[PDB]
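Hi R.,

Here are the chain sequences for the assembly we discussed:
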Amino acid sequence: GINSGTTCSNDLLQPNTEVFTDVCVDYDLYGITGQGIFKEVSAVYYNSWQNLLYDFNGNIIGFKDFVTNKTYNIFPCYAGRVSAAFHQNASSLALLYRNLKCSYVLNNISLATQPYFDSYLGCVFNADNLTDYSVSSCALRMGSGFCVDYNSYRFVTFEPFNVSFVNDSIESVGGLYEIKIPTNFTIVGQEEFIQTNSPKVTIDC
Amino acid sequence: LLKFDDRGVITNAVDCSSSFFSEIQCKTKSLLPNTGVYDLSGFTVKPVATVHRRI
Amino acid sequence: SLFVCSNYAACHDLLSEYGTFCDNINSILDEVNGLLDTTQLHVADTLMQGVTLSSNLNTNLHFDVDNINFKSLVGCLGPHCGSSSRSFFEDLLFDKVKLSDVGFVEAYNNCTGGSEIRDLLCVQSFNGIKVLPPILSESQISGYTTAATVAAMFPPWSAAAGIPFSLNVQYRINGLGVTMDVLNKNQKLIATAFNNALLSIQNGFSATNSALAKIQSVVNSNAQALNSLLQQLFNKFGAISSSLQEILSRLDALEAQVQIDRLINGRLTALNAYVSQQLSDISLVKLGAALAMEKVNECVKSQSPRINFCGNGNHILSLVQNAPYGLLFMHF
Amino acid sequence: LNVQYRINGLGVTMDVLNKNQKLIATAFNNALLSIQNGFSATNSALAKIQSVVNSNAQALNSLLQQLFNKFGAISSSLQEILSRLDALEAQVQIDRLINGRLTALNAYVSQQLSDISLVKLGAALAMEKVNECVKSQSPRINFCGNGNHILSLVQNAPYGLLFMHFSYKPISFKTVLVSPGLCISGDVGIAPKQGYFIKHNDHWMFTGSSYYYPEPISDKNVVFMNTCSVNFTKAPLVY
Amino acid sequence: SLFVCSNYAACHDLLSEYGTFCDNINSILDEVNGLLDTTQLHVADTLMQGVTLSS
Ligand SMILES: *[C@@H]1O[C@H](CO)[C@@H](O[C@@H]2O[C@H](CO)[C@@H](O[C@@H]3O[C@H](CO)[C@@H](O)[C@H](O)[C@@H]3O)[C@H](O)[C@H]2NC(C)=O)[C@H](O)[C@H]1NC(C)=O
Ligand SMILES: *[C@@H]1O[C@H](CO)[C@@H](O[C@@H]2O[C@H](CO)[C@@H](O[C@@H]3O[C@H](CO)[C@@H](O)[C@H](O)[C@@H]3O)[C@H](O)[C@H]2NC(C)=O)[C@H](O)[C@H]1NC(C)=O
Ligand SMILES: *[C@@H]1O[C@H](CO)[C@@H](O[C@@H]2O[C@H](CO)[C@@H](O[C@@H]3O[C@H](CO)[C@@H](O)[C@H](O)[C@@H]3O)[C@H](O)[C@H]2NC(C)=O)[C@H](O)[C@H]1NC(C)=O
Ligand SMILES: *[C@@H]1O[C@H](CO)[C@@H](O[C@@H]2O[C@H](CO)[C@@H](O)[C@H](O)[C@H]2NC(C)=O)[C@H](O)[C@H]1NC(C)=O
Ligand SMILES: *[C@@H]1O[C@H](CO)[C@@H](O[C@@H]2O[C@H](CO)[C@@H](O)[C@H](O)[C@H]2NC(C)=O)[C@H](O)[C@H]1NC(C)=O
Ligand SMILES: *[C@@H]1O[C@H](CO)[C@@H](O[C@@H]2O[C@H](CO)[C@@H](O)[C@H](O)[C@H]2NC(C)=O)[C@H](O)[C@H]1NC(C)=O
Ligand SMILES: *[C@@H]1O[C@H](CO)[C@@H](O)[C@H](O)[C@H]1NC(C)=O
Ligand SMILES: *[C@@H]1O[C@H](CO)[C@@H](O)[C@H](O)[C@H]1NC(C)=O
Ligand SMILES: *[C@@H]1O[C@H](CO)[C@@H](O)[C@H](O)[C@H]1NC(C)=O
Ligand SMILES: *[C@@H]1O[C@H](CO)[C@@H](O)[C@H](O)[C@H]1NC(C)=O
Ligand SMILES: *[C@@H]1O[C@H](CO)[C@@H](O)[C@H](O)[C@H]1NC(C)=O
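And here is the predicted structure of the full complex:
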């Protein structure tokens, strides 16, 4: 019965520290090591012999105190990933925490040092928003129709294509229709390269 | 990151841990990386306390 | 940095030996993502090929022509089409299934507060498995589809060879050997038949359907692949246990290198297999996008003389509406 | 004559094509020169060619870089591990390096089969593109070029083919009243084959769908209809 | 159950560690088999599209 049980060593003196809630801290759990977020909740499924709860894989997502008799649910910590938008001519980085509101980031992850701005995908850094504008093509595509550019760093919605407009009537006024018939033309020839062959390679053991 | 000139003399260096710019700089092995969206993994929080429960 | 080794330095130092593997994995994932982006941009470009809208056009004012009802197909009623261009049909389609890009974004945003644990997206996101949103949101694609439809039906008929919709139907029926004498007298009847067919396909999603089956199949297949990849972390792979914390806290770190190496090798093998099927499905969806390319360009903006290619039988014409992870058509 | 006939398919008037012969020839030559010298700056074709060449070089470099991976052994160089150990316990290190190299080789051949299938599909696309847009012009709207396609040419390119899709494109327009259909007798309508119907001095005329050129109404430019719809222009004053 | 280990219990007990591998293999094989079946059904359906025989 490794890392679980009652009888065990007392060489490393450490008193019974009180349990903390809503904090991503490390725990001992009478042997079951790991780090997580403890949340307080009341349960009724616990019985006399029942004193711990697992999942289908085998992970722990909750337990019952041995002395306090208070039910606690173990939640996983946050180990996400931060993106960046670095331009060649720029000297700063447009850091963005995807799907994470920067309020929680400023109070429990980082410190407010750069001009932040809460957006739809999360909270960007080193950039202000200019969503009322529209860029035909952005070098960096952050996602969901949002892009950034250097000028400094901005936040403009991505609109790669849009239809032209003509100020003409659409109703059949006078029994006829209004259309735009061309009167002059020219020939423009584009090009397209289609890959057919590939360089053959040979590998020998 | 150690950049070398034509005579084997170190010109510029990257810390790789000072900020996200250093990591992006040494991720592509270039002093000035090209314009692109670089992902910086390994982002996580650290514990602020230690709880110990025994009988 | 998070899948094979979550937050352990003892595991991250050994990862340096297989740095080329991780670099190749990131490179192939980035190129397939770029391929998907190019396909999406190509679809958005072909929707706006030679389309021409009118500034004075107001779908909220005029929404009926030649006794044809199309309110359920045209979105963003009015000239302020900048808030929500989702039409009624697209709204119903997006209401049947909620695992779209918006649903993914909302699910990831809801992971900050620990009010739920049954969702697998949080345990998936905490292990380096995330589903990034596409370059173009579904609102933009929905706006493109409704713009193409309203332009193909109202003057200027850009995608209708400069012919009104009623005349286009009357001429398309003549291609399938019919008498022009009965088409003129059967005008209100053909309009009501068209409206009835549109309503039938509109409310036909209540029971099971082929389109709904395919959409649920692709969503469930993606979820199943992600679950299978996430389940690989709970495999012992011939070691004492599959938990890195237990191995690191049970051994003296001198003989644990072989167990860590075995687990790392197994996880890298699973990752290589997964990226292999990833390239396979990327090629498959690319071919499907090409099929949609010719299908739209030859059956929506015009009617190519290809017998039994758009629909199934005496095909007349077709329409286009936005759908989750694809397109949907009305082959009349 | 092939160009003169291909332009007629995109709704144009044959009266202006005959007089605009030297001008269309100079326009074609100018377009050819523009695409010929257009490789000076960045271009889509050059980007694709450099992309495939650089991708092949990158794949080869990544495969060659695999030989410098320790793979959990003491070193990645076979000579050092062979001259450092007694060849009795070096079998495990050699086996680990061999297993890693074989795994990398299997992964590389997997992506090799993937790109082979991709280039095969691209070759098939080039097959139908050439057979339907070079030797002839298949009636597929917006398939060869992008827009009012006329014809195309073919030239050799490294690891592929290149084309010049000459497409028709207008520069100026004009707004005029049109009518898609109209009745000319006692419920005996007509319909333009390619174009519209315009009004000019109390008498109707027919014009092309791409050139503003009024023409007299004749059977060679109209489709006879035995019965017309009610929502058509009532113009019974005809020949 | 028959390829890597034919009829040996000593080999079958160790196979439990890589159970996900076998499950994924069976899943992908069933998927490609179903895809082949759907293609065959599609070909048989297009052959009988608008066909009409006489008794
Ligand atoms: C936390 O939960 C445990 C588990 O129920 C509690 O221990 C229980 O304490 C009661 C009160 O002493 C015990 O009842 C006693 O039973 C004996 C017969 O064995 C009887 O003679 C006594 O008069 C008394 O009724 C009960 O047996 C005991 N259960 C166990 C499993 O040990 C504990 O008190 C709880 N602590 C808190 C702070 O709520
Ligand atoms: C991005 O910057 C803008 C500054 O312009 C922040 O304010 C938002 O501005 C837009 C228009 O510029 C608002 O959209 C529309 O506003 C009108 C009223 O002006 C309203 O009637 C419409 O229904 C529509 O909402 C937008 O509402 C407004 N935002 C707020 C919260 O009022 C914007 O907040 C910045 N972006 C973010 C994500 O904070
Ligand atoms: C260190 O190594 C780099 C990379 O090999 C060297 O950069 C290379 O520099 C040469 C000449 O400066 C470039 O050659 C170019 O060739 C074209 C075609 O002949 C010509 O038009 C250009 O004017 C230029 O001469 C070469 O492209 C470039 N390599 C890359 C990858 O861009 C660099 O010179 C080396 N430095 C030293 C001190 O050895
Ligand atoms: C980024 O910096 C480069 C370098 O200055 C800019 O390139 C210059 O662009 C101007 C504008 O046409 C030219 O006159 C110069 O000759 C260019 N110089 C070089 C070295 O290329 C580039 O425009 C900048 N881009 C942005 C977005 O600011
Ligand atoms: C001919 O055009 C008229 C418009 O001037 C059509 O009349 C309207 O058609 C819309 C189309 O749904 C109806 O919603 C309106 O109620 C109609 N109004 C009236 C006063 O009739 C007419 O339907 C068209 N007829 C044909 C055969 O196309
Ligand atoms: C995150 O998930 C919770 C839990 O489902 C959502 O809370 C629900 O909110 C709706 C409307 O706001 C209520 O009708 C439900 O009763 C709530 N659920 C519970 C269990 O109380 C919450 O809305 C979600 N948030 C986001 C942004 O998706
Ligand atoms: C030895 O164990 C006893 C009882 O567990 C404890 O009181 C004492 O502090 C321990 N001494 C050391 C040095 O660990
Ligand atoms: C950190 O988060 C907890 C709950 O998530 C909250 O109670 C606490 O106030 C936060 N820290 C700060 C400094 O606000
Ligand atoms: C189309 O979008 C671009 C930017 O994305 C903008 O500059 C242009 O004016 C738009 N065209 C319109 C609104 O007609
Ligand atoms: C349409 O707009 C242009 C530019 O704003 C203007 O020159 C033209 O007169 C307008 N036409 C009509 C019919 O309003
Ligand atoms: C068409 O435009 C060109 C240049 O823009 C001009 O030289 C030519 O005369 C124009 N054609 C007509 C018929 O006006």
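Chain E touches chain C through 13 residues (CB under 8 Å). The pocket of 2-acetamido-2-deoxy-beta-D-glucopyranose (ligand 8) is lined by residues A 22, 107-108 (CB under 6 Å).

Let me know if anything looks off.

Best,
T.
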